[model samples]
Target: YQIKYENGIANRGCLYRLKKVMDRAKAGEALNIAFLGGSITQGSLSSKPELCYAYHVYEWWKKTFPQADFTYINAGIGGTTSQFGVARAEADLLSKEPDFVIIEFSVNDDSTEHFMETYEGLVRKVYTSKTKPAVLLVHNVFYNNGANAQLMHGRIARHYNLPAVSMQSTIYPEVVAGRIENREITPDDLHPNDAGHALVASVITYFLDKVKTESEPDYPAPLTKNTYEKSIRHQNSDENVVCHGFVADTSAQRDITDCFKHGWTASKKGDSITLDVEGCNISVQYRKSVKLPAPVAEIIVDGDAEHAVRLDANFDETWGDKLELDTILEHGENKVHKVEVRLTETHENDAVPFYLVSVIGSSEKAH
Candidate 1:
């Protein structure tokens, strides 16, 4: 079971290490595995919770060691960062006393406050815990663009000599080289689809096998090669670019009647649109007018007054920033829904019209 690293970068061989830990558990030892992270770990876009990487790993462990009693815990919360994980550590993680803990927060740590502090704190706590823990740094969709939080976290893992798994190192070059298709990611270009999740599982399995043979007589070496440069070239060429429009419909639309109700409309421009989906969560990207800076708005889903969702405009600072939102909806064939974008606060000057770049939703079970 030699580990392969076909693309550039060194993978920490997380899954390979996991198998070693699993073997220990099966030898009349107790094992507790916990997965902690944001939407990806929560299986937001995946069709089912069981399909999530966390559960996928659990299934693998069960099949591998049928006699072992394992307690698998999933503590993934949507729209959270490592900071949030630290805040709720006592209740969500530490209290569980897990024999092994998998931490994933690379994608959602962009806006995290005191990222290193929170991350380091979590690791230190796990180290001192009764149960030994392993940390995993997940690479999200935008990893290839440049250095990300995961890279920073990876260094920390190395400093502690703790096993660290990097999905980014394994996937980024493929994405940049265009060997892998972009459609594998969600509309936001941040999350993975079912196939993408399967790739993740495979990578984990490969790494786990590699760790077991490190000291073997004929240790299998990892593979490194440029397997699909042609595809990368095609993706790099502008002529081959593909445009995917916002997925929306008129019958399943919402109202924009409150865009200016709070006087914020004086400085900002807003729009209302309806989106149709069986039962899903919607993610959108918008830019505010130049004169007014970025305007903050609220998202009202299905006429729920108390459940009015607040929209942060900070994401607009980036060239193509978008707000990622997820909500569970009722099941049905044709579900008509209304969404309201209301400008709540007025700026000093007249804001420019905001552009709704794209709107895409995934079924609740698509995780």
Candidate 2:
């Protein structure tokens, strides 16, 4: 599917918050801005993290308002989608109490109903935040074309009346039409190079400038149906993850393809990691080693019937990141319960050790 080039609204719903942030900047008060997404937002292939588009936009805001007191946070993770974004938002993002946030994940998510659900989930997490930060959704692209995740995310963005920018609309078409060279944009075709990141900065900067000068709600923005209202939120973070046999240890000498939390593991096969949470959704974020010893882990929630959910990473192709392999424990009841993961079998591969990266879910209360 293709996203047609249409300029995002300058006086959209978020413009109100942008105005307030700029006002706070003028008042010499501290302003917090956050960026959350996949590898592109994580500074992949930009030589340095500061050269990534997120930092560029942060620099632009500071340059635009030299006197602005600002805190810039980049909470991006590589090889993740909205599912993980919604799951990690609380610890990695909302904890910062940002006044302005930029979310970009379309490129990493697959095309499915799951995309719409999780994308809406992320939107709800930010939209429903107590601090009420202004949120912006950015649609990035693939080497071949724009990802299908955008079609769904765009709908949710419109539903929430969010201001958005689109690389697919602005640049991909140019690349497809041969006006701009794709090689120059992103050499390897997955992550943006320095020059590509600069282009992203330019587009986002363009949107901010438009809002900076636009009149206040010259006319009220059109409201779309709240397709995101049913979206579920996942807020569980490492701090909220209550572990029993699971030991909090960052001493996993191997590099885990995850961030923000210490990897906890247990040598004993019966070790369990548990959590007490609210909400009807659940997920476990763990790392898998390709050539290391890994144990088969089983998840049982509510324990009402002791039904076991197992994840076997021993033979699975997904190495390092098996976060998206989250299995839903239940759809109703929305009750707080003990969710646990236990190593049911002996370590099969002695090459790698047994470890649990972190637990992610839709239900997390302040610990």
Per lDDT, the best of the predicted structures is 2
Can you write out model 2's per-residue Cα lDDT over 93-145, one digit (the tens) per residue?
88989999998988888866666767776777686787888888887778676
Error at 92, model 1, angstroms: 0.7
Q: Pick the candidate with the highest TM-score.
A: 2
> Model 1, 164-228: lDDT tens per residue?
55556676556667777667654445666776676666666555555655521222221111111
Question: What residue pairs are clashing in model 2?
Answer: 234-362, 292-352, 293-349, 293-352
TM-score of each: 0.54, 0.78
